[PDB]
């Protein structure tokens, strides 16, 4: 059992803007929180969240 032992705990993930591993949504809406940014390190904090 390595599940979610690690539920709740609100925690602060640090990055910076580069090309092939963040990226932002183009879309037309302001973008705030997880949406803010996605690729591939982003895919990797999904798989781990
Ligand atoms: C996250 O918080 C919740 C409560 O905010 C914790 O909930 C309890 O979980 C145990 C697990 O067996 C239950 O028996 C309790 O009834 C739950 N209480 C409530 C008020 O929900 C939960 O354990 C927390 N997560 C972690 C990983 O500690």
Redesign the pocket.
Known sequence: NIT??????SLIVTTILEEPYVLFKKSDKPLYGNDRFEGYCIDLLRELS
């Open positions: 979610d032992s690690l539920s709740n705990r």
